[PDB]
Amino acid sequence: IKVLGISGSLRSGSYNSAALQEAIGLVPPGMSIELADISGIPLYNEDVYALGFPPAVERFREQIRAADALLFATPEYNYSMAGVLKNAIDWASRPPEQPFSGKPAAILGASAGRFGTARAQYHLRQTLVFLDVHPLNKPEVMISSAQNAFDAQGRLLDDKARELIQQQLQALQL
Amino acid sequence: IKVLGISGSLRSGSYNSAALQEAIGLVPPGMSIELADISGIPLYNEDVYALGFPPAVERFREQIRAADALLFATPEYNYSMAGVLKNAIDWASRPPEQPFSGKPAAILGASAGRFGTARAQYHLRQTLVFLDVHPLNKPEVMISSAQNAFDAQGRLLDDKARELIQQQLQALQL
Ligand SMILES: Cc1cc2nc3c(=O)[nH]c(=O)nc-3n(C[C@H](O)[C@H](O)[C@H](O)COP(=O)(O)O)c2cc1C
Ligand SMILES: Cc1cc2nc3c(=O)[nH]c(=O)nc-3n(C[C@H](O)[C@H](O)[C@H](O)COP(=O)(O)O)c2cc1C
């Protein structure tokens, strides 16, 4: 079961990239996770699209088409998903045969304050559902106070979190 | 009264851009609309921001700070606002003293086909309130079937949408 991990944050220390990094070692037997790189994807511009998909967008789209399932790690930016993550989905959603169609997915999000991700995870869920994606309803995974939830070398300390992801990955495998 | 028009679309024929332009031909005395340019704003990345605002973002934040009101024309992509617009908002919202705070703003959205922008407008309204913007609730301005609503090189053929822009600009002045 090839699972594609998608972070909505480009920063090297990104707690969201970190959580998907930890999910690699939390997968169950039979499943495996590979992180997608969207740093190369540009700002959406219909004119550019008309001329054809940017190299970085073709690679991404084909990673989605090929993966058996998707795992999203969306940060919340101002009461919604991060623009960057949305922008990448925008590109990837263009005809013909946008690869999202039919794929199952799991959503989780990391924020640093005391809330976050609740609104971004909902918006992301609706956006994905709009593209015919079938996301897992539960469990619900949110990493609050992430700045304390991880250490320098990006490692998740909360057993609850480690366990929740394991749960989701299984719930995903089913 | 200086007003900032922000289009969430970068394509040359953008109906959301074309709509704001029309509004310029509709301003009443004592009000002027200038169109911000976000095309130069890069994808958001915390590591880049840590070293200072890109010039484009800088130019953008100051226009917001200086303008007495904001006029947003957001297209709707995949059940939410355009990723491009959200990214510009993400960049502009960073401390120190992000300029959205306090500014009154009005929303409108241009889309082709069936529905459009109703979700994007909601998310946008929400995100902006989160930044302490005072967006107007009435009137709702949705330009549907935009592909027919506009002719070659601008000009809003639909008289209905015209009334709303006018009304929206008048309410805004108040
Ligand atoms: C433009 C921007 C908007 C943000 N908005 C919110 C927000 O609405 N709520 C919240 O709890 N945190 C918010 N944050 C903080 C992020 O959740 C926090 O910095 C997080 O560590 C980012 O993780 P990532 O780098 O893994 O994406 C925002 C950060 C930025 C740069
Ligand atoms: C990611 C994406 C999703 C879109 N989804 C729809 C849709 O569901 N229904 C529809 O009628 N048009 C849809 N459109 C078309 C736009 O509404 C149309 O191209 C519009 O004219 C763009 O206006 P703008 O250039 O002012 O943003 C979509 C466009 C993009 C880029």
From Swiss-Prot, chains A, B:
GO terms for molecular function: FMN binding; FMN reductase (NADPH) activity; identical protein binding; NAD(P)H dehydrogenase (quinone) activity; oxidoreductase activity, acting on NAD(P)H, quinone or similar compound as acceptor; protein homodimerization activity. FMN binds at residues 9-16, 77-79. GO terms for cellular component: cytosol. The keyword Coiled coil does not apply. Its cofactor is FMN. NAD(+) binds at residues 111-118. Keywords: Flavoprotein, FMN, NAD, NADP, Nucleotide-binding, Oxidoreductase. Gene3D superfamilies: 3.40.50.360. Its EC number is 1.-.-.-. It comes from the Bacteria. Has NAD(P)H-dependent FMN reductase activity. PANTHER family: CHROMATE REDUCTASE, NAD(P)H-DEPENDENT FMN REDUCTASE LOT6. Homodimer. Belongs to the SsuE family. This is NAD(P)H-dependent FMN reductase PA1204. It comes from Pseudomonas aeruginosa (strain ATCC 15692 / DSM 22644 / CIP 104116 / JCM 14847 / LMG 12228 / 1C / PRS 101 / PAO1).
